[PDB]
Design a protein around this ligand. Sequence first.
Ligand SMILES: CCCCN(Cc1ccc(-c2ccccc2-c2nn[nH]n2)cc1)c1nc(C)cc(C)n1
Lengths: 10, 358
Amino acid sequence: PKRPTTLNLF
Amino acid sequence: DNNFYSVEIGDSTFTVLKRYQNLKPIGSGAQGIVCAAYDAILERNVAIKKLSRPFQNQTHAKRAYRELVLMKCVNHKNIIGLLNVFTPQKSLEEFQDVYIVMELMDANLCQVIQMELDHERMSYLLYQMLCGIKHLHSAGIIHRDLKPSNIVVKSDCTLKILDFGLARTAGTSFMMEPEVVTRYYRAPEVILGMGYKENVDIWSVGCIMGEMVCHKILFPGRDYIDQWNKVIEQLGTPCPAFMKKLQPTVRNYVENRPKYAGYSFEKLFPDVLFPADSEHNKLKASQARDLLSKMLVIDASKRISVDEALQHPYINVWYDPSEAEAPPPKIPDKQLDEREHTIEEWKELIYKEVMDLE
Ligand SMILES: CCCCN(Cc1ccc(-c2ccccc2-c2nn[nH]n2)cc1)c1nc(C)cc(C)n1
């Protein structure tokens, strides 16, 4: 399980 | 035209160093006006906070001082970083304002509450949030004002806690201007005037995670007192062992309230509302709901702690000693100076701090 590296805040 | 120019930020007037450019307001709170900004010397945008009225009283004072000290002594990858702090007044006599410059992220958790998340992002955001709180608790420091607008995030999915004016050590819950803490996130012990320990923060975590799942505030509530009605209607009227801990004046009122059975955690949090499930056993809506059911617990002596929260299957897939067990921050003793000095004497400590911190 790899840490997420993106978050669509838009 | 020395080292500071000024600008009309909405209603207030920021008088700040020239390296800070563009300004534009972004947050108006119970403890300061904050603006976005571009720092030419650093060449990256920054956040500037004017501590709104640091001396209209001993209460604001100690709150300002504490923000200052704390922003300097508590560092962790999940705690907002203190870039710079200064005052545009030239002498302790002229001394009147304090400006705190810090990292600028991309958005609020209020923003994250407005989107659909997947189990990795939701689980991960909580883990970072718990690592930050854990760093504070390892020094016996309790945040007390955790809410969606005090948690900030970057587009690379990183999270940092922010805002430490209300921060302090455990003890009596009698605060001044309680209006400073948003009520939808007040823990039962803060509401009923009982004592509070570090896990008072975990109740906020619970309220917040609940809002992320539901997208609507968990315990709405029209006023300070109605807040309690909302909690018991959802969680149930607490047992007699807990009423017995209330202050005589409060206990009586709590016992005269109508009796509520509360609702189960699955009516409260049906699956649909949780991230889509996969075939995994950790990142599963039921594990997440289980964690919620351990935070949204009224009697704080049966509530989960930050350490048990980092150990929880739903959060634990990301556990890393370096973040979850970082050596504790150390404070000079200035905070250990939880003593009450006069408005003047405060002006004294503050001016110092600001000077030898610039
Ligand atoms: C559901 C309940 C709403 C009631 N309530 C809370 C409250 C709790 C404790 C006391 C108290 C009384 C006697 C001696 C000590 C303390 C005390 N205070 N802190 N520690 N001990 C007074 C009020 C409350 N609070 C505020 C701030 C605004 C309103 C409208 N109500």
